[PDB]
Amino acid sequence: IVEGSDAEIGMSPWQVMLFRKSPQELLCGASLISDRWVLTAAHCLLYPPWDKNFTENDLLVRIGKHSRTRYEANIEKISMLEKIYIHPRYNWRENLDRDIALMKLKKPVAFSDYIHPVCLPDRETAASLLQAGYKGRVTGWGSVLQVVNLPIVERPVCKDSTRIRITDNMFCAGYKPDEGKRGDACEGDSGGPFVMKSPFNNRWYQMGIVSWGEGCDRDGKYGFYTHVFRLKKWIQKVIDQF
Template structure:
């Protein structure tokens, strides 16, 4: 999954992200907010690694520095998963290769396509709660909104249930078939006509070995905001 990038804080926390062009990474807003750092501090200390397969080999050839961080303007705090997107601007111009490629923004809203298969890659914990060093991926299915909402109402009444206007869920099927802690910020990527699209960004999961549902920010409704941040000149020209 050549679009998957690793973001690492000075304290060693790992967040996943997704390369969407030569200068921008899409990730989870709450995962960055949970670091309790200002944007200035993130720019100074956050490191981005591209083209990484083994997290033990984070050397200079993979390292990219951060120029800026943009949270969605309606993002909530680190424990309320609404508008849960952030964009990380990179200082260096990323050169594409077989191991480094961007994923496309969606042209359709895949959140409503129940049963649709998507793929999530990352370096999150395994079922034994040990961090994995190799980039892994798992295939998951887009879930029914009502079933996901009912699950959170029943099992996690203190957690805001997913909002179908901007979020969706995938089914978690137990050990070996789940996203895990450490995968937050990763994209659920779908293949459509030979093209790969970032359908969602992981916000919340039930743990590696648990059945239930994981919650994603639906990328499709946020395309306008993403384009305004990443290509402001083009958006302004189109508006004239």
């Protein structure tokens, strides 16, 4: 995260850090959607061009964190993965279309003031909240969790900002050059959640997954996000079948 600010404690209890087990390396962000399932981006786990193809045993997730480096005893939970599920039509060769993956934890994590699941949108929430000009929130790391609120950008503006072909499975967000504010999620924040608070039931919904950009927080460029609701059917299929 660049140009954001310190998150308050427990402000994003669904936040998850995805780490390479050894050597130790913060790979991406992720989010807790139930006591056994973590949502992230597929490219964090699979990217053939760079020989990236992690298995369940190559990783650990850290849940409930606020500090970037310190072990938060009795607050954070470190979990192993039972299985990894990548979207079958994840398109890494062209534009990261369907950049989504699910990770099932070996054991369920207990919720606390610092660990709590975010909701996934339904059709009503997607239609009411995913509109240009409305702001969502992205979280990640720079010594403490960072947060930045960013506006969803009109699809034509998103498409005109890049030479990459944008699909219906992505949306973009970030301030335009004439908006006077900055902030963005960077490559290191990939896989993390873009959330929105419903003004109707006061709940937080994960509308996006940080997927890709062309340089963090650049004028006239925007961060791109996996459209979570577009892929909700696949998420439900995996969780229901396991």
